[PDB]
C-alpha cells in the first residue's frame, strides 16, 4: 500500500507546539506530522520497511562524509496529508571532527518567511539596544553641561533641573 515517492537529504525538522515540521529545500516543501510516531514494528509497513531502511543507509553512506554521524533510530511519522516519512537524524561529531501537494510548498513558504523575519527584526532589536546603551552614556556626559535640556528631551516635556 506504500510506494516510494521521494528521498530528501538535509531535511530540517523543527518541533512546533503540536507538530513536527519536516522542511525540505530540495522539494521546497514542509510536511507537518503529529508529535506521536507511527510504531515502526507495525504490520502495515512490512513491505516498505526494508526498502526505506536500505535507502536511508545508502543516502547516509553517499551524501554525508565522515564529519557527520547518525542520530536516533529510523522513526516513522504519518503526515497530515497521508504521506509516510522515515526520518534519521544527522549530527556533527564533537572532538572527533492529497494528489496536489501545493499545501506542502505553502507551509514551506510560511516557515521560510516567519523564520527569516523572526531573525531579521531580532537582529535589529539587539542592535537597537546596543545603540541605546551608548546613547544613555552620552546623555550622562551631556547631563553635566545642561541637565534641563537633556531631561526635557528624554521625557518630551519642559523640565528644569540644575547640575
Amino acid at each position, epitope marked *: 500500500q506504500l510506494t516510494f515517492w521521494e528521498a530528501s537529504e538535509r531535511t530540517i525538522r523543527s518541533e512546533a*507546539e503540536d507538530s513536527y515540521h519536516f522542511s525540505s529545500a530540495k522539494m521546497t516543501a514542509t510536511f507537518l506530522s503529529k508529535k*506521536q510516531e*507511527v*510504531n515502526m514494528s507495525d504490520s*502495515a509497513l512490512d513491505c516498505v520497511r526494508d526498502e526505506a531502511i536500505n535507502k536511508l543507509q545508502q543516502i547516509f553512506n553517499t551524501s554525508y562524509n565522515q564529519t557527520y554521524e547518525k542520530y536516533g533510530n529510523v522513526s516513522v511519522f*504519518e503526515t497530515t496529508g497521508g504521506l509516510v516519512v522515515f526520518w534519521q537524524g544527522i549530527k556533527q561529531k564533537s572532538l572527533v571532527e492529497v494528489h496536489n501537494l501545493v499545501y506542502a510548498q505553502l507551509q514551506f513558504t510560511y516557515d521560510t518567511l516567519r523564520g527569516y523575519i523572526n531573525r531579521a527584526l531580532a537582529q535589529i532589536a539587539e542592535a537597537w539596544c546596543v545603540d541605546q546603551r551608548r546613547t544613555l552614556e552620552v546623555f550622562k556626559e551631556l547631563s553635566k553641561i545642561n541637565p534641563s535640556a537633556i531631561l526635557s528631551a528624554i521625557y518630551n516635556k519642559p523640565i528644569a533641573a540644575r547640575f
Partner: antibody
Framework: QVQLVQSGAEVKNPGASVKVSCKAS????????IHWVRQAPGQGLEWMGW????????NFVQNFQGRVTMTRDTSISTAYMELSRLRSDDTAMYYC???????????????????????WGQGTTVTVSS | QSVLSQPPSASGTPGQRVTISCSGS????????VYWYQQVPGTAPKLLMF???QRPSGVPDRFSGSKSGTSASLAISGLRSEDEADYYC???????????FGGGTKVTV
C-alpha cells in the same frame, strides 16, 4: 459514560506484591493509552508510566522499572498492574487515567505521547505496613 | 533543568481573581502544551485545561488559561467555595521523553 473503575483499598507487607485493576467503560478499551500515576497521602502527584492496551507495550520510570508486571484483559476491558518488592515508600494512592492519545491512527499504530489525562479513575489506596 | 516549578500556595477573596503560575524550561512548556489538572482534597484529580487555553466540556467558564514562552498561567475568577483545591500543571518533556507534573498550588480560599 466514559469512566474508569479501580479496586478497593489494599494492605500489603514489605517484600510482597500488590495488584491493581483498572476497568474501562463507555469507550473502547483498546483505543487510548493508560497512564498510571501515584501520589503520597500528603504529597503531590508522581507519574509512574504508560501502558498500551492495544499492543501491550508499557514503559515506567526507572524507580518502578523491573518491579511492575503489566497484564490486560480485552474481554473484560481491564488492565492489571502488579507491583513487587514493595518498600515503606509505596504507601500511596494509585490512579489510572485514560489518555487522549490514540493507540492506532486510521491506518497505523502509534507510539506514546502525552495529550492530557482527561478521564481519571477513583484511585486505589495501597498501604505497606509491617 | 527538565523540571517544572509552580508556587506552593495561593489565596484570595470570593468574587476576585487568582492567578496560578507554572514555570518550565526551554523544553516541555517551551515547545509543548500545558495541561491543567484540578484535585479537590479527598477526591480523584480532574482535568481543567486540555490545551494551552482550551477548556473541556462541563468545566465552568470562570477558568482561563494563557501561555507565554517558558511559562503558563491559570486565572480563576469568581473564586467560589468549590474552587478550593490543588492545581497541578503538567507538560510533556522531550529531553526526558516523559510527562512532568508540578508541585501543587493549594488554593486556601
Amino acid at each position: 459514560q466514559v469512566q474508569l473503575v479501580q479496586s478497593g483499598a489494599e494492605v500489603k507487607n514489605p517484600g510482597a506484591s500488590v495488584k491493581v485493576s483498572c476497568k474501562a467503560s463507555g469507550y473502547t478499551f483498546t483505543d487510548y493509552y493508560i497512564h498510571w500515576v501515584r501520589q503520597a497521602p500528603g504529597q503531590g502527584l508522581e507519574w509512574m508510566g504508560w501502558f498500551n492496551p492495544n499492543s501491550g507495550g508499557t514503559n515506567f520510570v526507572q524507580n518502578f522499572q523491573g518491579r511492575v508486571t503489566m497484564t490486560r484483559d480485552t474481554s473484560i476491558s481491564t488492565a492489571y498492574m502488579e507491583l513487587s518488592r514493595l518498600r515503606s515508600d509505596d504507601t500511596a494512592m494509585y490512579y489510572c487515567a485514560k489518555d487522549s492519545a490514540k493507540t492506532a491512527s486510521a491506518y497505523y499504530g502509534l507510539n506514546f505521547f502525552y495529550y492530557g489525562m482527561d478521564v481519571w479513575g477513583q484511585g486505589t489506596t495501597v498501604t505497606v505496613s509491617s | 533543568q527538565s523540571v517544572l516549578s509552580q508556587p506552593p500556595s495561593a489565596s484570595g477573596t470570593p468574587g476576585q481573581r487568582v492567578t496560578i503560575s507554572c514555570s518550565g524550561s526551554s523544553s516541555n512548556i517551551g515547545k509543548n502544551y500545558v495541561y491543567w489538572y484540578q484535585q479537590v482534597p479527598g477526591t480523584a484529580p480532574k482535568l481543567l485545561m486540555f490545551k494551552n487555553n482550551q477548556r473541556p466540556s462541563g468545566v465552568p467558564d470562570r477558568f482561563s488559561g494563557s501561555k507565554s514562552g517558558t511559562s503558563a498561567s491559570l486565572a480563576i475568577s469568581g473564586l467560589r467555595s468549590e474552587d478550593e483545591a490543588d492545581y497541578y500543571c503538567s507538560a510533556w518533556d522531550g529531553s526526558l521523553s516523559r510527562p512532568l507534573f508540578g508541585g501543587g498550588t493549594k488554593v486556601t480560599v
